Amino acid sequence: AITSVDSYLLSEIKPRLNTVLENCYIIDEVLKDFDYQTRESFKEAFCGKNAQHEVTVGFNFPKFKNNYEAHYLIQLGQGQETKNSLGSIQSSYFEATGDTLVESSTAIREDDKLVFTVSKPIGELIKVEDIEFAKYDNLQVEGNKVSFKYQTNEDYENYNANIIFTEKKNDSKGLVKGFTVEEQVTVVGLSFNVDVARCLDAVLKMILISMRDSIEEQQTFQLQNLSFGDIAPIIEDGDSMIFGRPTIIKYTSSLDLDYTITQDINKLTFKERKDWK
Amino acid sequence: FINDRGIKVLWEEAYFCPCLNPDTGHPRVDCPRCHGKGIAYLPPKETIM
Numbered sequence: 001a002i003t004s005v006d007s008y009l010l011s012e013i014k015p016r017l018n019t020v021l022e023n024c025y026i027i028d029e030v031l032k033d034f035d036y037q038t039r040e041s042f043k044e045a046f047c048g049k050n051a052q053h054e055v056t057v058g059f060n061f062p063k064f065k066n067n068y069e070a071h072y073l074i075q076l077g078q079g080q081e082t083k084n085s086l087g088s089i090q091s092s093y094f095e096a097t098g099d100t101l102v103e104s105s106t107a108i109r110e111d112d113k114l115v116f117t118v119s120k121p122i123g124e125l126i127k128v129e130d131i132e133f134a135k136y137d138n139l140q141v142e143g144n145k146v147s148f149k150y151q152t153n154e155d156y157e158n159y160n161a162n163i164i165f166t167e168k169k170n171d172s173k174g175l176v177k178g179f180t181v182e183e184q185v186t187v188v189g190l191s192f193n194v195d196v197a198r199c200l201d202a203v204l205k206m207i208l209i210s211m212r213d214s215i216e217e218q219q220t221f222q223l224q225n226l227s228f229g230d231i232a233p234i235i236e237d238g239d240s241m242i243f244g245r246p247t248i249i250k251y252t253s254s255l256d257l258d259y260t261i262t263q264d265i266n267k268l269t270f271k272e273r274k275d276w277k
Numbered sequence: 278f279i280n281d282r283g284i285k286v287l288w289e290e291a292y293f294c295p296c297l298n299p300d301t302g303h304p305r306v307d308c309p310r311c312h313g314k315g316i317a318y319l320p321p322k323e324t325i326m
């Protein structure tokens with residue numbers, strides 16, 4: 001697909017940041033190496049459900065004033081194409097497949113089959129969690145349902161699973177045409193307190209490490225590489241300075257389009273014609 | 278003195294438009310209340326400046 005690393009990072013960082021900040025022992029583990037007073041002051045101010053201060057995330061160049069006490073500024077950077085395929089063919093498909101998804105589901109009995117229901121039509125099934133079927137189990141997929149023989153499996157009549165699958169758009173042939181790009185985004189934790197900037201740096205590094213395992217950047221946005229700048233005053237001529245430490249996140253990812261092929265051939269036919277010269 | 282020396286103007290007061298994207302923080306370019314500027318304006322007021 002076409003991709004937007006900045007909007008991915010914003011969407012991914014915001015919930016993760018919230019869920020760490022609402023959970024005191026995570027911060028208590030992340031900041032174990034800092035000075036005791038720095039740790040306790042940060043945990044008192046920003047952390048837990050009762051926290052009176054708050055962190056914020058957003059893109060650069062807003063028209064309004066931000067929470068300069070603690071704010072992650074996201075800042076889309078450079079990139080370049082790095083590797084190309086022969087014919088620019090990144091892949092080919094017989095059935096137009098959408099995004100990868102993971103969904104929780106439960107088995108139910110139906111007509112002496114077990115079935116799992118999924119919210120969308122299954123374009124491909126990658127994994128039913130914790131199950132490997134035998135041929136006897138007569139595994140079949142149909143529409144948005146996975147179906148599974150009941151006879152030997154009655155103990156599992158309400159078994160709970162996670163389905164990893166991917167959507168289908170439509171039944172069509174085509175070529176995925178495109179290339180790989182290596183692209184940079186900068187993130188900086190702004191604070192007018194230097195110890196807050198240093199803690200926001202630690203929290204962001206933890207978040208990015210945790211992010212490396214996510215399906216989003218396992219399937220796309222691969223090879224996350226991190227670089228770190230000096231701590232410096234970002235703005236120097238207010239009533240106080242604003243400090244930050246930049247980090248650069250670099251990703252390798254595919255830019256591509258679905259070139260559908262309308263041509264289809266369903267019968268050869270043969271004829272002999274005679275040359276009398 | 279000001280009423281003698283100033284020209285008549287219409288003054289309208291700025292405020293940020295509530296159409297700003299809750300994630301990206303940028304204005305919606307199709308917004309009718311503000312024509313792609315992030316700033317909406319209250320009804321005009323007659324003044325001399």
Ligand SMILES: [Zn+2]
Nearest residue numbers: 294296308311
């Ligand atoms: Zn508007």
